Design a protein around this ligand. Structure first.
Ligand SMILES: [Mg+2]
Ligand SMILES: [Mg+2]
Ligand SMILES: [Mg+2]
Ligand SMILES: [Mg+2]
Ligand SMILES: [Mg+2]
Ligand SMILES: [Mg+2]
Ligand SMILES: [Mg+2]
Ligand SMILES: [Mg+2]
Ligand SMILES: [Mg+2]
Ligand SMILES: [Mg+2]
Ligand SMILES: [Mg+2]
Ligand SMILES: [Mg+2]
Ligand SMILES: [Mg+2]
Ligand SMILES: [Mg+2]
Ligand SMILES: [Mg+2]
Ligand SMILES: [Mg+2]
Ligand SMILES: [Mg+2]
Ligand SMILES: [Mg+2]
Ligand SMILES: [Mg+2]
Ligand SMILES: [Mg+2]
Ligand SMILES: [Mg+2]
Ligand SMILES: [Mg+2]
Ligand SMILES: [Mg+2]
Ligand SMILES: [Mg+2]
Lengths: 93, 131, 87, 64
RNA sequence: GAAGACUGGAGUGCAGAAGAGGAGAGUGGAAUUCCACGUGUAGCGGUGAAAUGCGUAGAUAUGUGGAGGAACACCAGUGGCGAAGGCGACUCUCUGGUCUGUAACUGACGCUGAGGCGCGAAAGCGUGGGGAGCAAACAGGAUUAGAUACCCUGGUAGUCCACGCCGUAAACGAUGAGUGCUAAGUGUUAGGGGGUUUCCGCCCCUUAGUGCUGCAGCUAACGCAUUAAGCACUCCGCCUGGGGA
């Protein structure tokens, strides 16, 4: 069943470590039998409200076609525990 | 209907009279056709016709009214319901309205009116009162 | 619910002929599979009553079908009951 | 008045499209009543779902 | 009763649709309360009036930061879902029911159902947690001929969550379930078909819910009236003057 994950990376980050944290979660989804279809970044945007002391963020979108529903759970846990993502949302469609 | 189709036939006729309808159609059966034929031959309706279809068939009846209404048939009732069946001896066949009405009795030679069941001296299950 | 495929293998396995879908041998098998699937959900989710009612309704329907099959034709009933491991 | 998505055949109100949803929220972000927007109930439900889903991702303000 | 046959009741298959239906886990923003720190200073709060109360040990107000609990503005509508109780923030996992369309499949496989077994608002009980607001009991201030009350200032059990009991209500549509038949007019929810139009769109038909107004019919009257309290068949529960009770 297809999926869609959005997440916001903090603004104050440099391109190298930003790409590292972009690709770490792609790898973590691929650690399970979940095929990625997209990994494009949706770009810098200004938050309508300050979720943290922050005001801007890198919006990133990922498409998946998983079945076991464990890859999304592991992504949820290890993105909640990390401080390089401020907000994420998984959607089924 | 679910339980008793003869009562359904009688109540369809009664419901049609109350609003002065002209005809009515209903599902067909081997006993309903014969009841309709008795009603026609006795003089309580105008006509009966049979329309054919896939599963069981349909029967339509054309009702009868006087010159200015005055319902020819003014009352029906069922006597032997599925919850209690009543049988009448040859000397117990009821007389409806001093013979003004008729009673239908399913004897051993088909279904008969009240009058002709007293000619063969036979009896059986009474189905309905019509008057 | 059983995934459409999972239902279709059962249907194809218990067919009494090449095209049936509603014969009692098929309905009883599918209902048995469904209530077995609901058994462990009731076991682990012990406070879901609105699904327990559905389970009970399924059990009653399947029992009525079994009674009809037994009355109509005993040999089919005794073959199918051994196939499904009922009683 | 006439419905928007019904006229334009828009069968999906995605939550990634902020500019479209800007029309249906008032100056404070409160969802406009269906009487003023003029949309059908079936599409109003999808619209409200999308508005809340978009609000969750900081795309639209909760209170402006 | 037996031996066959049929598909209209019932169910399955195939294609679509809507929904605060239920259980578990995670997350969100407003708002009250409290705490810390700057500005400031003489009041704040409260009522028909006033007082109890809080404040120079510096509040109330105002700016920033932190802690915790409970409920989910606008959407929201005689709208939706569920057998009833009831269900309103968002996401994921596990799940039950319903409607429309097709005619592929089985061929009466159906209805009701005493005793039995399950669910059952709130208050209440047992063990272990939590406690921001609210508030039985309680204290003080008011009103009154009196005021174990209404009003004001506070305030514990509880309201919340885990497990197990309790089994009640104006648990109401004061209307048991199933089926069939009997004028019309107009809103709304979820679908299907057709005519027109370039599409939107306008009009008609139809299935399943939900409202209103009304003919026949019924009722003691009020009123009900295709969602009957009308005309009928099947099964169940209940009633036979009031008090004692
Ligand atoms: Mg059918
Ligand atoms: Mg739902
Ligand atoms: Mg739900
Ligand atoms: Mg806050
Ligand atoms: Mg302050
Ligand atoms: Mg219902
Ligand atoms: Mg055949
Ligand atoms: Mg029943
Ligand atoms: Mg009982
Ligand atoms: Mg309680
Ligand atoms: Mg307790
Ligand atoms: Mg006092
Ligand atoms: Mg208080
Ligand atoms: Mg009682
Ligand atoms: Mg009592
Ligand atoms: Mg109630
Ligand atoms: Mg009562
Ligand atoms: Mg009834
Ligand atoms: Mg159309
Ligand atoms: Mg209707
Ligand atoms: Mg009706
Ligand atoms: Mg009455
Ligand atoms: Mg007495
Ligand atoms: Mg007495």
């Amino acid at each position: 069943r297809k999926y869609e994950i959005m997440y916001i990376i903090r603004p104050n980050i440099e391109e190298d470590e930003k790409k590292a944290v972009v690709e770490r979660f792609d790898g973590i989804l691929t650690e399970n039998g979940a095929e990625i279809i997209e990994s494009k970044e949706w770009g810098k945007r200004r938050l309508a409200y300050e979720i943290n002391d922050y005001r801007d963020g890198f919006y990133h979108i990922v498409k998946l076609n998983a079945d076991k529903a464990d890859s999304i759970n592991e992504f949820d846990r290890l993105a909640k525990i990390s401080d390089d993502i401020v907000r994420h949302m998984v959607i089924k469609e | 209907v679910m339980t008793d189709p003869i009562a359904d036939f009688l109540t369809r006729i009664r419901n049609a009279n109350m609003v002065k309808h002209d005809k009515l159609e209903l599902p067909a059966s081997k006993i309903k056709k014969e009841i309709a034929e008795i009603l026609k031959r006795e003089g309580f309706i105008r006509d009966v016709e049979y329309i054919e279809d896939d599963n069981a068939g349909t029967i339509r009846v054309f009702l009868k009214y006087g010159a200015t209404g005055e319902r020819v048939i003014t009352g029906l009732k069922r006597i032997s319901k599925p919850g209690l069946r009543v049988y009448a001896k040859s000397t117990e066949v009821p007389k409806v309205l001093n013979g003004l009405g008729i009673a239908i009795v399913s004897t051993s030679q088909g279904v008969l009116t009240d009058k002709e069941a007293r000619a063969k001296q036979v009896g059986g299950e009474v189905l309905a009162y019509v008057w | 619910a059983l995934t459409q495929e999972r239902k279709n293998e059962i249907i194809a396995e218990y067919r009494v002929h090449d095209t049936d879908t509603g014969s009692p041998e098929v309905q009883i098998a599918v209902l048995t599979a469904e209530i077995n699937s609901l058994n462990e959900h009731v076991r682990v989710h012990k406070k879901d009553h609105h699904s327990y009612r559905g389970l009970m309704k399924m059990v009653g329907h399947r029992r009525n079908l079994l009674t009809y099959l037994r009355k109509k034709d005993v040999q089919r009933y005794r073959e199918l009951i051994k196939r499904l491991g009922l009683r | 008045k006439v419905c928007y998505f019904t006229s334009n055949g828009i069968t999906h109100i995605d939550y990634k499209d902020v500019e479209l949803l800007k029309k249906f929220v008032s100056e404070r972000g409160k969802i406009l009543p269906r009487r003023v927007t003029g949309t059908s109930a079936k599409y109003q439900r999808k619209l409200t779902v999308a508005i809340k889903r978009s609000r969750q991702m900081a795309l639209l303000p909760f209170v402006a």
